[PDB]
């Protein structure tokens, strides 16, 4: 079975065809590409090794970021796993690995990595789900040169949750990408600046990760699965000395579905013993991490399994941190969007199985770094229909056809809005400058 993550559908990539993507080349500057992965092995992917990061096709351990990014761009269509923006093995992908498990390990600069993308990879699009706080004239000039030479540069705005500029995203020659969730709401962590240019799916993004390093969840009732609806295993964290460390609960639980009603700020769970506890999320991640509140409400009641669904404030699919100070949540708990939670209440009383599974080959990630590949992936796809147009023209098309979000007009949170592949393509169909 193959799933189409919400982001793929929202950007409109599923209705277009990448049959011509072979005339485009997108270079991913990141932590490598797990070429051994079933959903990535057979892509038209190449790479340029660097003395400091080993093989581009071997991310190593706990260095799956680049693989997740690559999966969003080109996870292969094959009835298993997921699908990326261009899943039919047409697009040319070049990999430049600048990150090792320990961190940046490239023998040279970011400018050098981009040079390699262009000179060695023949890249038309360079996607960078990375960022730093510093900026320089040499770098600004080098990237402006590549841009004017016809290379489209795209980067992540950052997840610091403030107005700071992250580079290269904040240079004028680069598209700064913001993150929004499945309800098109601005991601609380997404940095907001006057450089933010466009938005892409960046909360609860399912994609490929280094084989065996992922994690998934599922909800089954009447022999049917809610997996395709989006079920996120709780990113549980428990105390570990001077901080918190991941303490995932990977197990399965089965029992009659029962909901803990939320009245004001109080819970009416009753006796959840031997049952799967459905509960609406109280509060939302931002200045704090309240996931534990609704979650513990269920647990305290004796629930064997817990299903937390989004509230009306943030109805989209959330993948929040489950900060468990007392390490109380020792049962499998998951997160689903509001629509899914409301559909589940119709099944109350029925036998339900909730499960969190470790050692998987896919996983849900959050980040402007996840929104970025949606944008660069769509940019490459749309560009393949009109390779004659310049990078600046393609960039203009994406901006001119993005779906305005939040307050009317361009804003620092979402830029011009949610990228729209179909509209962008239609734009260039008229001419390289649109209608
Ligand atoms: Ca697949
Ligand atoms: Ca910029
Ligand atoms: Ca707006």
User: What is the longest distance spanned by two Cα atoms in the chain?
Assistant: 66
Resolution of this model in Å is: 1.8
Cα 134 from Cα 174, distance rounded (Å): 15
Ligand 1 centre to CA of 229 (Å) is 17
Return the ∠ at Cα 320 (arms to 315 and 323), rounded to 5°: 135
Half-sphere exposure for 208 (CA within 13 Å, toward CB): 32
CA torsion, ordered 293, 278, 357, 319, to nearest 10 deg: -50
Is the C-alpha dihedral spanning 417, 179, 9, 375 positive or negative? positive
Give the Cα separation of 336 and 225 in Å (integer): 13
Q: Which ligand is nearest to the CA of 414?
A: 3
Q: How far is the CA of 413 from the centre of ligand 3 (A)?
A: 8
Listed in order, strand segments (DSSP E) in 264-370 are 266-268, 275-280, 305-309, 321-323, 333-336, 351-360, 362-365
Q: How many angstroms separate the CA atoms of 182 and 243, rounded?
A: 31
Phi, psi of 237, rounded to the nearest 5 degrees: -125, 135
Torsion over CA: 16, 19, 23, 29 (sign): positive
Q: Nearest CA to 425 among 70, 10, 11, 146?
A: 11
Q: Under a CB-based contact definition with an 8 Å cutoff, are residues 369 and 390 in contact?
A: no
The DSSP code for 12 is T
- Cα–Cα distance, 77 to 158 (Å, whole number): 30
Distance 190 CA to ligand 3 centre (A): 15
Tell me, what DSSP letter sits at residue 186?
Answer: B
User: Which ligand lies nearest the alpha carbon of 40?
Assistant: 1
Residue 29 annotated as binding site: no
Distance 398 CA to ligand 3 centre (A): 14
Is 372 assigned a ligand-binding role in the annotation?
Answer: no
C-alpha to C-alpha distances, 121 to 24, 68, 92, nearest whole angstrom: 11, 20, 9
Residue 78 marked as a ligand binder: yes
Helix (H, G, I), strand (E, B) or coil at 375: helix
How far are the Cα atoms of 148, 206, 405 from residue 231, in angstroms, in the given order? 43, 10, 25
Q: Say which ligand is closest to the CA of 415.
A: 3
User: What is the token pair recorded at 316?
Assistant: 């989209």
What are the backbone dihedrals phi and psi of residue 359, each rounded to the nearest 5 degrees, phi first?
50, 45
Give the closest residue to 331 by CA, choosing from 339, 322, 340. Answer: 322
The two structure tokens encoding residue 306 = 């817990």
Residues with CB under 5 A from ligand 1 (ion): 2, 39, 76, 78, 81
**Cα 364 vs. chain centroid, distance in angstroms?**
7
Residue 414 assigned as binding residue = yes
* Distance of alpha carbon 320 from alpha carbon 364, whole angstroms: 11
Q: Report how far residue 346's alpha carbon sits from residue 230's, in angstroms, rounded to the nearest whole number.
A: 18
Ligand nearest to the CA of 404: 3
Which residues have C-beta within 8 Å of that of residue 56, sequence separation ≥ 6?
Answer: 32, 33, 47, 48, 49, 50, 95, 96, 97
Residue 105 to residue 89: CA distance in whole angstroms: 30
Sign of the torsion angle spanned by Cα atoms 166, 423, 15, 124: negative
User: Residue holding tokens 């950052």?
Assistant: 158
| Cα radius of gyration rounded to whole Å, the chain | 22
Ligand-binding annotation for 157, yes or no, is no
Q: Which residues contact 223 (CB under 8 A, 6 or more apart)?
A: none
How remote is the CA of residue 337 from the centroid of ligand 1, in Å?
A: 23
> Which residues have a catalytic role annotated?
30, 65, 369
Whole-Å CA distances, 109 to 38, 93, 105, 400, 403: 32, 21, 10, 33, 35
Using alpha carbons, select from 179, 23, 146 the residue that is nearest to residue 86: 23
Q: From CA 389, how far away is CA 140, in angstroms rounded?
A: 24
Rounded to the nearest angstrom, the distance between the alpha carbon of 264 and the centre of ligand 1 is: 43
**Distance between terminal CA atoms of the chain?**
41
Q: Which domains does the chain have, with CATH numbers?
A: 1-214+360-435 (3.40.50.200), 215-359 (3.50.30.30)
Alpha-carbon span 366 to 187, nearest angstrom: 9
Residue 382, CB half-sphere, CA atoms under 13 Å: how many? 34
Q: Which residues of 166-190 are buried (b: 16+ CB within 10 A; e: fewer)?
A: bbbbbbebbbbbbbbbbbbbbbbbb
**Rounded distance, CA 106 to CA 324, Å?**
37
Integer Cα distance of 195 and 165 in angstroms: 8
Residue 197 annotated as binding?
A: yes
Is 205 strand, coil or helix? strand
* Residue pair 193/414 in contact by the 8 Å Cβ criterion: no
């Amino acid at each position: 079975a193959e799933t189409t993550p919400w982001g793929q559908t929202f950007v409109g990539a599923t209705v277009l065809s990448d049959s011509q993507a072979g005339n485009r080349t997108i270079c991913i500057i990141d932590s490598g590409y797990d070429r051994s992965h079933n959903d990535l092995n057979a892509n038209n992917v190449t790479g340029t090794n660097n003395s400091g990061t080993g093989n581009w096709y071997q991310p190593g351990n706990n260095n799956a970021h680049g693989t997740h990014v690559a999966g969003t761009i080109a996870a292969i269509a094959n009835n298993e796993g997921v699908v990326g923006v261009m899943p039919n093995q047409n697009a040319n992908i070049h990999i430049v690995k600048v990150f090792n498990e320990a961190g940046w390990g490239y023998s040279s600069s970011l400018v050098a990595a981009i040079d390699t993308c262009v000179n060695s990879g023949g890249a038309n699009v360079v996607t960078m789900s990375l960022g730093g706080s510093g900026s320089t004239t040499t770098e600004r000039n080098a990237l402006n040169t590549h841009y004017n030479n016809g290379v489209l540069l795209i980067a992540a705005a950052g997840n610091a949750g403030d107005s700071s500029y992250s580079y290269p995203a904040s240079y004028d020659s680069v598209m700064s990408v913001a993150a929004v969730d499945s309800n098109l709401d601005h991601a609380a962590f997404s940095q907001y600046t006057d450089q933010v240019e466009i938005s892409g799916p960046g909360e609860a993004i399912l994609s490929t990760v280094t084989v065996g390093e992922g994690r998934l969840a599922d909800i089954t009732i009447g022999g049917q699965s809610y997996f395709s609806n989006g079920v996120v295993p709780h990113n549980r964290l428990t105390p570990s000395g001077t901080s918190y460390a991941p303490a995932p609960i990977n197990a399965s639980a089965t029992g009659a579905l029962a909901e803990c009603t939320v009245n004001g700020t109080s819970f009416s769970c009753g006796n959840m013993a031997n049952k799967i506890c459905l509960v609406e999320r109280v509060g939302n991640q931002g200045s704090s991490y309240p996931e534990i509140n609704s979650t513990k409400a269920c647990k305290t009641a004796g629930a064997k399994g817990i299903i937390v669904y989004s509230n009306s404030a943030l109805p989209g699919l959330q993948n929040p941190f489950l900060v468990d100070a007392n390490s109380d949540i020792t049962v499998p708990s998951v997160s689903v969007d509001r629509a899914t939670g409301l559909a589940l209440k119709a099944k109350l009383g029925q036998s339900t199985t909730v499960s969190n599974q470790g050692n998987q080959d896919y996983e849900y990630y959050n980040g402007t770094s996840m929104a970025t590949p949606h944008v660069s992936g769509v940019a490459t796809l749309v560009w393949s229909y009109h390779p004659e147009c310049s990078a600046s023209q393609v960039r203009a098309a994406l901006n001119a056809t993005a779906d305005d979000l939040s307050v009317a007009g361009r804003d620092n949170q979402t830029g011009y809005g949610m990228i729209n592949a179909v509209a962008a393509k239609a734009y260039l169909d008229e001419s390289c400058t649109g209608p």
